[PDB]
Design a protein around this ligand. Structure first.
Ligand SMILES: CCCCCCCCCCCCCCCCCC(=O)OC[C@H](COP(=O)([O-])OCC(O)COP(=O)([O-])OC[C@@H](COC(=O)CCCCCCCCCCCCCCCCC)OC(=O)CCCCCCCCCCCCCCCCC)OC(=O)CCCCCCCCCCCCCCCCC
Ligand SMILES: COC1=C(OC)C(=O)C(C/C=C(\C)CC/C=C(\C)CC/C=C(\C)CC/C=C(/C)CC/C=C(\C)CC/C=C(\C)CC/C=C(\C)CC/C=C(/C)CCC=C(C)C)=C(C)C1=O
Ligand SMILES: CCCCCCCCCCCCCCCCCC(=O)OC[C@H](COP(=O)([O-])OCC[N+](C)(C)C)OC(=O)CCCCCCCCCCCCCCCCC
Ligand SMILES: CCCCCCCCCCCCCCCCCC(=O)OC[C@H](COP(=O)([O-])OCC[N+](C)(C)C)OC(=O)CCCCCCCCCCCCCCCCC
Ligand SMILES: CCCCCCCCCCCCCCCCCC(=O)OC[C@H](COP(=O)(O)OCCN)OC(=O)CCCCCCCCCCCCCCCCC
Ligand SMILES: CCCCCCCCCCCCCCCCCC(=O)OC[C@H](COP(=O)(O)OCCN)OC(=O)CCCCCCCCCCCCCCCCC
Ligand SMILES: CCCCCCCCCCCCCCCCCC(=O)OC[C@H](COP(=O)(O)OCCN)OC(=O)CCCCCCCCCCCCCCCCC
Ligand SMILES: COC1=C(OC)C(=O)C(CC=C(C)C)=C(C)C1=O
Ligand code: SF4
Ligand code: SF4
Ligand code: SF4
Lengths: 80, 155, 98, 317, 67, 172, 96, 49, 385
């Protein structure tokens, strides 16, 4: 099997690449340290406006002000 | 005045036609070979406007090189008849200008002119390539002299 | 608008140039000048079944920015693949062959 | 002053094309050791005006065509589209801004196919019909390889806007990420003009193609529209793959460097005409259906992953 | 020699930069000295229109904050 | 003696795929045509720099004349009996001096083949075949040369013919 | 290298007989190649010989503005050259 | 005679030595007017030959 | 199927052909080439013309090979007369025969390419062909149909500078061949267009009477310059370029090799050409020298009779074949005792080759046929005669 690839790399040297990159692209996402961020860098974009919720005093996390230390702070996207 | 305007304008019309003659050779020749050498590097014909040659519909001048035999005689007429009206014929060879080493044979037209009107006759068995170039240049002098617009004004 | 003006001007230029072409000039049999290409038809619907392929692949530019990026990737790969396997069958079928 | 723009957008491409007829006769010449035009002007600079002012004066013989309606709509369609694909071209400042620009260029490019179909069918002839059917096969087959190269590449600049390709290239040419795409793009721009080692149609030695029954004007236009998108599909390569400088200030530098690379890619096609024997109609297809299309589809799959795993998903807008 | 193919390109080398410089200065002269703003998404238009409302009928005109 | 004209380790297999995929072999042709636009064209300026010829160049016929002024042709008929295109008719008479000359001479230059069998047969060097090749004509009648379009023709190029005869006489 | 060719080119243009002289050559003869005048001729033709150029361009004629009733300024003719200089221009003999 | 750079352009692009084999004739050509020549011409009965 | 009559005017081939084709869709079902478009009657006219005044019929049979066509006739008329050309003349005919093979091959390889679509090889080589014409013009007087290889010798001696100029051309020509060599031999595009197209098997090639590079391309060993030597080829050394896989490419490669092998033969001819006279000098066969006819009566009588009447070759018939660049060119000259021939059957390498087009171009598309005619090097003068 391994020496059959040798003529298929000498002659037919196209379909080899096309079935070597067809796949390579299926394994790069499953094995990369940085694939988690694509659904996150794309999740941070505030395209529409963030509606604020009414305060009850029962919500400690919700950052009261845009500059509170609380809330979704992305010091990640920076120097991702 | 009006006469001067239509003298200058056909001078323009004539310059365009003679500057760019696109010729289609009838091959069928020993003369065709020589014609090729006119298209070749030594005496580039393109430099004179003539092109490395195009097809019948887009051809301004037909160069009949070589004997026009009786079986090819109907074909030369239809190709001549399939060209745009501003259209001219240069007859290369001493075998298209009349007969040739092969003159009196049961199968040879004595001059392609018989089939189609001829404008410049280039003489020579293999008219030397320069010759044909002189003949094409002579067509350009014939095309400069033509005064179609003046004749319409003087109608 | 501007696009209209342009595309329209582009037409007028085209027409004029054929207007002048048929009028500037101002019989002789001058005018005198088939089996089925089954291969061609095949090639043609091969292109139809593939052009529509692109039409389903053009959303990628705007789906890459979907939250479920993992889902897009998966959905796309299958399309590109199932279409490649189709082409591949054609190959074996020799339909691609001319 | 919008009309001043069209007048300074169509004159400077019909006056350029004209001198590509010249430049396609000299560069080919000196390779053939033969000077091109030298005489009508100083160095042939005045030859296209001659055969421009000449072809139009030859009888536009409607040769017993089946339908003039087509014979005289096909040649106009062509120059109409070709001179339109320039309207959204992404110069530092495009005549018109069109989101979906690259689609526009793709779509309009496609319509051209008709010119081949209509012209061939109208002019009754074996050669005409033969060439057309065969020619469009090529054109259509190459659209499917252009689109993907076009699509794939998009994932990288992340929008269909030509005008963003310039930004995506603010610091690098996309030739280096995608030279495989740029190879097959070059052939899909060189063979979708029915041009080059690939001139199956207008097969001249074998076929006398569709434009055969055309002459004088009707021909000129078909021609004018083959050299006015011989400059597009190189002008795109100078936008999509070869990214010249763009500075908010000095907005000419881009156009100047756009010049320097579009003439090479317009002068690179000229080495081809003078270098490659023509592909045979079967081989051309097998080049796309069994070699390019596979590589194109796989690399498209590669480019949809590259953003996700490199987390480089381009910014919409 | 090959010196001569240049006269030809020279014209196709200016015939091709006349368009890129032209379109990019008939914009900076028909948009008040500033690039023609690009309205790609609804929000850009709104802002543009808003501007027209704020001063003259022309987007290009701009209110510095003294208005 | 006969010669045959057209008769895998990864190193070789990669090399083959580096010449099929990243085409490197059509490039050795593009550089080959790039090697020629930078050379000097061979084209001669035609009308001003006519190409090179030889004193042997066979073109437009002409009837040489003795320096005294006496036509050299003595109507032998040794030059239509050989002219294969059957082009020459030289009906003659005694010229009323008692001498022997043509009243008729002819070439139909639309039948001649420029073979020079008439210049090598002439025992007197009367008929030659000059180095003209710019004598194209707009009509058919201007090619049926008579004795007076060949004799004043030979009264034109005799400065240019004799140099070539004297240049090639030994080899002939 | 590139320094030398431009100096040689500007020389030819200015010394080909002047601006009008240049135009009458560049625009009637398409030639600016300076060459030794082998000899002027009746009718006013001009013959030049530059042996450094290749075998086709080392012998060129520069025709008259006009000759007899010819008006041969724009109408340059192949047979205009006299029989005397055909033996040389076509290089059948080196002898001027 | 061409600028060395331009000609090295043609030697490198061609891959072959090109100053040596010129397709143009400069001094390679024999000059015309070659000196006149003298071509070379008992029991010579034709019945024997 | 669809009867598309390939153009008689069509730019492809040699423009004197019809080739009615049946188009089974894209592929061509059958070809029925209709030659006759250039039958001038060459063989009829020769019967009415003396042996000297018929030589010209021959350089105009295959106008690409001028002096080799003549070399056949000249060999045929010599054999009928039992006279042989002088030693210098035989070398000159071999020198000119090899220059014609280079020029025929430059014609065949470059014109095949422009049919295929490669345009530059033709221009580079055609300038090299104008240099070679000049050699014909500087020995005969014409650039074509020179009529120089006459019965008994060549008509006139070589001019004093020809052999030096032939050395300078041959010295640099080899680079010009491989310059075309690099352009077309390895290109993907050329090999695909030419390789495995029009394969002809060895026995079929002999049966169809191919007799040329078409015979040698399929691997059959036969040149006619080494099998049945003529002139002085027996004294010059060369290698026949045979080939396997009889396909257009192998046939192209063979034609490029013969150009190279001909430079080897031209090299020997310049190195070893003997001092001597150029025509047999029994005045009965070859005309007397210009000085002799003007000073000695026997020479005037012999000049008058030879030019006016003729050689009067003894009654007999001969078929003499020489390896013309296209293939075996043979003249079957039947002769009565008269000065003018009785029959002259010109065997044209080409009448046989074009017959093979239908068999060779089977299972092939329209484009392949353009290559099939190109690889037969057919010029219709020889076929039509
Ligand atoms: C870059 C362009 C270089 C152009 C050039 O001159 O090439 C010289 C040379 C090639 O020419 P060559 O082989 O030396 O031939 C010299 C001539 O035979 C003999 O040269 P010459 O001295 O007879 O001619 C010199 C020339 C004057 O020099 C030029 O040809 C133009 C130089 C432009 C330099 C930029 O004279 C002219 O005026 C004729 C010019 C013809 C072209 C038209 C002028 C350009 C018009 C552009 C706007 C329209 O190329 C170089 O030396 C290197 C060029 C730079 C790298 C490429
Ligand atoms: C093999 O196919 C081909 C031909 O047909 C056989 C050709 O003839 C040719 C040769 C053709 C040419 C030299 C060009 C033909 C004519 C033209 C110059 C078309 C351009 C005409 C114009 C009107 C350009 C001027 C533009 C304006 C409208 C002015 C704008 C202000 C080529 C190159 C070719 O590829
Ligand atoms: C579009 C522009 C057309 C301009 C045509 C005149 C300029 C071109 C030219 O060189 O013409 C030379 C000709 C004269 O040159 P010519 O072409 O007769 O010959 C010059 C010498 N050779 C043969 C080497 C070319 O000038 C004209 O006759 C122009 C006539 C058309 C314009 C008339 C006025 C309007
Ligand atoms: C600058 C580059 C692009 C240039 C594009 C525009 C180029 C044209 C510039 C103006 C040219 C104006 C004249 C064009 C030709 C006019 C028609 C003509 O010459 O006569 C033929 C026409 C027709 O030719 P005809 O009547 O002799 O017939 C020819 C034979 N048949 C019938 C087969 C066609 O002659 C006339 O009827 C009179 C025309 C007078 C035109 C006005 C003056
Ligand atoms: C007889 C000879 C042959 C005749 C026919 C020749 C061919 C004609 C066609 C040539 C090619 C035309 C291709 C047009 C494709 C569609 C263009 C398009 O969809 O874009 C229009 C654009 C869409 O909006 P958007 O993309 O958002 O714009 C950017 C800023 N927002 O913004 C717009 O919506 C602009 C307004 C719509 C313009 C669409 C195109 C109109 C074409 C009109 C042709 C006729 C002209 C008038 C008559
Ligand atoms: C998922 C895939 C996405 C991309 C798909 C692209 C299209 C796939 C097409 C598959 C084609 C299979 C086939 O039938 O091939 C037949 C081929 C010979 O056919 P053909 O090309 O017509 O030969 C004529 C030559 N003149 O003969 C062959 O089969 C040659 C096959 C060579 C390659 C086989 C697979 C190699 C995989 C290598 C992976 C990496 C190894 C290291
Ligand atoms: C590992 C990292 C992650 C993965 C990265 C991606 C995987 C690796 C990718 C490697 C890509 C290698 C190159 C692939 C694209 C090149 C096109 C191609 O695949 O070749 C097809 C074809 C081959 O021809 P052939 O020998 O007949 O092969 C088929 C045999 N049945 O080729 C041809 O014959 C086409 C010939 C057409 C005529 C060409 C004429 C010359 C053109 C010169 C262009 C010069 C400018 C090019 C650049 C332009 C830039 C805008
Ligand atoms: C294939 O190469 C050739 C051409 O290019 C396609 C020609 O135009 C021409 C000229 C065209 C015609 C119609 C005579 C010839 C002769 C030729 O051999
Ligand atoms: S004229 Fe002389 S050369 Fe031209 S074809 Fe007839 S024979 Fe051959
Ligand atoms: S020309 Fe010479 S040959 Fe012919 S007749 Fe007069 S003399 Fe006799
Ligand atoms: S040249 Fe040959 S053909 Fe012409 S006339 Fe003299 S002999 Fe007769």
């Amino acid at each position: 099997i391994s020496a059959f690839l040798k003529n298929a790399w000498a002659k037919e040297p196209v379909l080899v690449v096309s079935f070597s990159v067809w796949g390579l692209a299926i394994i790069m996402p499953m094995i990369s340290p940085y694939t988690k961020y694509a659904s996150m860098i794309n999740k941070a974009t505030p395209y529409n406006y963030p509606v604020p919720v009414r305060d009850d005093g029962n919500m400690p996390d919700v950052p009261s002000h845009p500059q509170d230390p609380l809330g979704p702070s992305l010091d990640w996207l920076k120097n991702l | 005045r009006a006469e001067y305007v239509v003298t200058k304008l056909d001078d323009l019309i004539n310059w365009a036609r003679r500057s760019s003659l696109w010729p289609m050779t009838f091959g069928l020749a020993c003369c065709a070979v020589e014609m090729m050498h006119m298209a070749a590097p030594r005496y580039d014909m393109d430099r004179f406007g003539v092109v490395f040659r195009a097809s019948p519909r887009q051809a301004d001048v037909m160069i009949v090189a070589g004997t026009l035999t009786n079986k090819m005689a109907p074909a030369l007429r239809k190709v001549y008849d399939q060209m745009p009206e501003p259209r001219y014929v240069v007859s290369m060879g001493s075998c298209a200008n009349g007969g040739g080493y092969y003159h009196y044979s049961y199968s040879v037209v004595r001059g392609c002119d018989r089939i189609v009107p001829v404008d410049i006759y280039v003489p020579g068995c293999p008219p030397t390539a320069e010759a044909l170039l002189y003949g094409i240049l002579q067509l350009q002098r014939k095309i400069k002299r033509e005064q179609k617009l003046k004749i319409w004004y003087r109608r | 608008m501007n696009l209209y003006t342009v595309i329209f001007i582009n037409i007028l230029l085209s027409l004029t140039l054929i207007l002048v072409a048929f009028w500037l000039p101002q019989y002789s049999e001058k005018a005198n000048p088939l089996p089925f290409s089954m291969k061609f038809f095949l090639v043609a619907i091969t292109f139809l079944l593939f052009d529509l392929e692109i039409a389903l692949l053009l959303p990628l530019p705007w789906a890459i920015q979907t939250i479920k990026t993992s889902t897009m990737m998966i959905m796309a790969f299958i399309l590109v693949t199932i279409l490649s396997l189709g082409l591949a069958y054609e190959w074996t079928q020799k339909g691609l062959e001319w | 002053m919008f009309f001043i723009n069209i007048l300074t957008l169509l004159v400077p491409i019909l006056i350029a094309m004209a001198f590509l007829t010249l430049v396609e006769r000299k560069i080919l010449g000196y390779m053939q050791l033969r000077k091109g035009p030298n005489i009508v002007g100083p160095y042939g600079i005045l030859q296209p005006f001659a055969d421009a002012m000449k072809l139009f004066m030859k009888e536009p013989m409607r040769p017993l065509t089946t339908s003039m309606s087509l014979f005289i709509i096909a040649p106009t369609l062509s120059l109409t589209l070709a001179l339109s694909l320039w309207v959204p071209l992404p110069m530092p400042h495009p005549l018109i801004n069109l989101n979906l620009g690259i689609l526009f260029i793709l779509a309009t490019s496609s319509l051209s196919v008709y010119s081949i179909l209509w012209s061939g069918w109208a002019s009754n002839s074996k050669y005409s019909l033969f060439g057309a059917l065969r020619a469009v096969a090529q054109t259509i087959s190459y659209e499917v390889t252009m689109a993907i190269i076009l699509l794939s590449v998009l994932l990288m600049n992340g929008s269909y806007s030509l005008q963003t390709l310039i930004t995506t290239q603010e610091h690098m040419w996309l030739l280096l990420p995608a030279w495989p795409m740029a190879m097959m793009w070059f052939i899909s721009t060189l063979a979708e003009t029915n041009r080059a080692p690939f001139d199956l149609t207008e097969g001249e030695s074998e076929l006398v193609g569709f434009n055969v029954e055309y002459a004088a004007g009707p021909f000129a236009l078909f021609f004018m529209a083959e050299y006015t998108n011989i400059i597009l599909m190189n002008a795109l390569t100078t936008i999509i793959f070869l990214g010249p400088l763009y500075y908010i200030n000095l907005p000419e530098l881009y156009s100047t460097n756009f010049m320097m690379e579009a003439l090479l890619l317009s002068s690179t096609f000229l080495w081809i005409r003078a270098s490659y024997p023509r592909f045979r109609y079967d081989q051309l297809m097998h080049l796309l259906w069994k070699n390019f299309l596979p590589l194109t589809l796989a690399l498209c799959m590669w480019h949809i992953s590259l953003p996700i795993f490199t987390a480089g998903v381009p910014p919409y807008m | 020699m090959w010196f001569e193919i240049l006269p030809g390109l020279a014209i196709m080398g200016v015939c091709l930069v006349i368009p890129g410089v032209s379109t990019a200065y008939i914009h900076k002269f028909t948009n008040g000295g500033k690039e023609k703003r690009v309205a790609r998404v609804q929000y850009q238009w709104y802002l543009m229109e808003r501007d027209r409302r704020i001063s003259g009928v022309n987007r290009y005109y701009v209110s510095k904050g003294l208005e | 003696t006969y010669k045959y004209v057209n008769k895998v380790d990864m190193k070789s297999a990669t090399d083959n795929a580096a010449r099929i995929l990243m085409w490197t072999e059509l490039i050795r042709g593009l550089g080959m045509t790039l090697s020629y636009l930078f050379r000097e064209p061979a084209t001669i300026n035609y009308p001003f720099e006519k190409g090179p010829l030889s004193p042997r160049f066979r073109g437009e016929h002409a009837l040489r004349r003795y320096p005294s002024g006496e036509e050299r042709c003595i109507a032998c008929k040794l030059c239509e009996a050989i002219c294969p295109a059957q082009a020459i008719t030289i009906e003659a008479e005694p010229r009323a001096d008692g001498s022997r000359r043509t009243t008729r001479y002819d070439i139909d230059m639309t039948k001649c083949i420029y073979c020079g069998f008439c210049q090598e047969a002439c025992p007197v060097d009367a008929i030659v075949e000059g180095p003209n090749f710019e004598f194209s004509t707009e009509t058919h009648e201007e090619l049926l040369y008579n004795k007076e379009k060949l004799l004043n023709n030979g009264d034109k190029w005799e400065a240019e013919i004799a140099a070539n005869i004297q240049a090639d006489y030994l080899y002939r | 290298e590139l320094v030398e060719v431009l100096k040689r080119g500007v020389q030819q243009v200015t010394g080909h007989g002047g601006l009008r002289g240049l135009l009458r050559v560049f625009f009637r003869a398409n030639d600016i190649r300076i060459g030794t005048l082998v000899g002027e001729d009746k009718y006013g033709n001009k013959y030049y010989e530059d042996n450094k150029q290749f075998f086709g361009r080392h012998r060129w004629v520069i025709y008259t503005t006009e000759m007899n009733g010819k008006n041969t300024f724009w109408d340059v003719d192949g047979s205009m050259v006299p029989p005397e200089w055909h033996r040389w221009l076509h290089c059948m003999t080196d002898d001027p | 005679s061409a600028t060395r750079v331009i000609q090295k352009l043609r030697n490198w692009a061609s891959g072959q030595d090109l100053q040596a084999k010129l397709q143009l004739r400069y001094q390679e050509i024999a000059k015309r007017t070659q000196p006149p020549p003298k071509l070379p011409v008992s029991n010579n009965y034709y019945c024997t030959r | 199927n669809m009867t598309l009559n390939f153009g008689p005017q069509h730019p492809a081939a040699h423009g004197v052909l019809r080739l009615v084709l049946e188009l089974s869709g894209e592929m061509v079902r059958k070809c029925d080439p209709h030659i006759g478009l250039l039958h001038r009657g060459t063989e009829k006219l020769i019967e009415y013309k003396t042996y000297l005044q018929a030589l010209p019929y021959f350089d105009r049979l295959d106008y690409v090979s001028m002096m080799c066509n003549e070399q056949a006739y000249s060999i045929a008329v010599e054999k009928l007369l039992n006279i042989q050309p002088p030693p210098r003349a035989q070398w000159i005919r071999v020198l000119f025969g090899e220059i014609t093979r280079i020029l025929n091959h430059i014609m065949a390889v470059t014109t095949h390419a422009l049919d295929i679509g490669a345009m530059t090889p033709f221009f580079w080589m055609f300038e090299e062909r104008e240099k070679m014409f000049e050699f014909y013009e500087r020995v005969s007087g014409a650039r074509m149909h020179a009529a120089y290889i006459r019965p008994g010798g060549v008509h006139q001696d070589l001019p004093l500078g020809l052999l030096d100029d032939i050395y300078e051309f041959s010295k640099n020509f080899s680079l010009r061949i491989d310059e075309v060599e690099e352009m077309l031999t390895n290109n993907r595009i050329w090999r695909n267009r030419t390789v495995d197209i029009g394969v002809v098997t060895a026995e079929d090639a002999l049966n169809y009477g191919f007799s040329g590079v078409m015979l040698r391309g399929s691997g059959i060993q036969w040149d006619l310059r080494k099998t049945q030597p003529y002139d002085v080829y027996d004294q010059v050394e060369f290698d026949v370029p045979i080939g396997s896989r009889g396909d257009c490419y192998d046939r192209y490669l063979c034609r490029v090799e013969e150009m190279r092998q001909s430079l080897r033969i031209i090299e020997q001819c310049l190195n070893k050409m003997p001092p001597g006279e150029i025509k047999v000098d029994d005045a009965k066969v070859s005309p007397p020298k210009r000085a002799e006819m003007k000073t000695s009566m026997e020479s005037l009588i012999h000049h008058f009779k030879l030019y006016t009447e003729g050689y009067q070759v003894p009654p007999g018939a001969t078929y003499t074949a020489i390896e013309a660049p296209k293939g075996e060119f043979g003249v079957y000259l039947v002769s009565d005792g008269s000065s003018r021939p009785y029959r002259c059957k010109i065997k044209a390498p080409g009448f046989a080759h074009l017959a093979g087009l239908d068999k060779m171009s089977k299972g092939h598309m329209l484009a392949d046929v353009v290559a099939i005619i190109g690889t037969q090097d057919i010029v219709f003068g020889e076929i039509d005669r």
